């Protein structure tokens, strides 16, 4: 959107998926441990557009703020060990289960600018995933449906599932939620192309920790009136996340 420049260290779990040749932003992502990065499956696999990256095709840049700059002494650049896409990711109809994990080649060193986000447990999800509760999304994507100089941030309220459904002809599932302001609410903002795979986070009032509740997934344009941004429901897919991390590292 319709967002603002982030503060330094405001989103130390934000990851940029970077294309090796040619050099350019591919997607957002997030750090969930010293060796695991969470993103959207469509960032990695989208057959209608001939998108199918493999490990060696990209890089993970962590600790960033500036979009284009090489941030010497601050960012870390990691290689991909292996990519895992949800086996029931539905790229043909509606991006259901739009989620992927990426294992890093070597562990990343935490710093003031690099630090993992929490993943929700069932009670924090129950507590926080309520219509009208606001979350925050971050990314280096389009500013309108140019490109920013530094990381952008917007706070957006979760929308009731009926309103989400009535706003689109797409078949929405329990593995998605939508967020954004209604026409009448005045204020606006949204994620857009380029923010894909980045996190929708919320700050628990119970333990003052940030949790990643969503992944930027899709939308009908960007910040259009009466449309909403759609997010992968991280808690709903946690069973799969754990199994992957359990069995693969």
């Amino acid at each position: 959107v319709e967002g603002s420049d982030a503060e330094i260290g405001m989103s130390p779990w934000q990851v940029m998926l970077f294309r090796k040749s040619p050099q350019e932003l591919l997607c957002g992502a997030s750090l969930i441990s010293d060796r695991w990065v969470l993103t959207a499956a469509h960032c990695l696999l989208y057959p209608p557009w001939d998108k199918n990256f493999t490990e060696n095709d990209l890089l993970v840049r962590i600790g960033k703020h500036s979009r284009t700059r090489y941030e010497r002494n601050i960012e870390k650049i990691s290689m991909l060990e292996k990519i895992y896409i949800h086996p029931r990711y539905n790229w043909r109809e509606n991006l259901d289960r739009d989620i992927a994990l990426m294992k890093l080649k070597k562990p990343v060193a935490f710093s003031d600018y690099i630090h993992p986000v929490c993943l929700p447990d069932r009670e924090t999800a129950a507590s926080l995933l309520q219509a009208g509760y606001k979350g925050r999304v971050t990314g280096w994507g389009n500013l309108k449906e140019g490109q920013p100089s530094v990381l952008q941030v917007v706070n957006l309220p979760i929308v009731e599932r009926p309103v989400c459904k009535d706003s689109t002809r797409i078949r929405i599932t329990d593995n998605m939620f939508c967020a954004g302001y209604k026409p009448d609410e005045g204020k606006r903002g949204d994620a857009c192309e380029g923010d894909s795979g980045g996190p929708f986070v919320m700050k628990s009032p119970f333990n003052n920790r940030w949790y990643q509740m969503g992944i930027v997934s899709w939308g009908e344009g960007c910040d259009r009136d009466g449309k909403y941004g759609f997010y992968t429901h991280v808690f709903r897919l946690k069973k799969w996340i754990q199994k992957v991390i359990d069995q693969f590292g």
Partner: peptide, 9 residues
């Protein structure tokens, strides 16, 4: 649009 990263990576 991107500054050249270390050739190392």
């Amino acid at each position: 649009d991107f500054e050249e990263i270390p050739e190392e990576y």
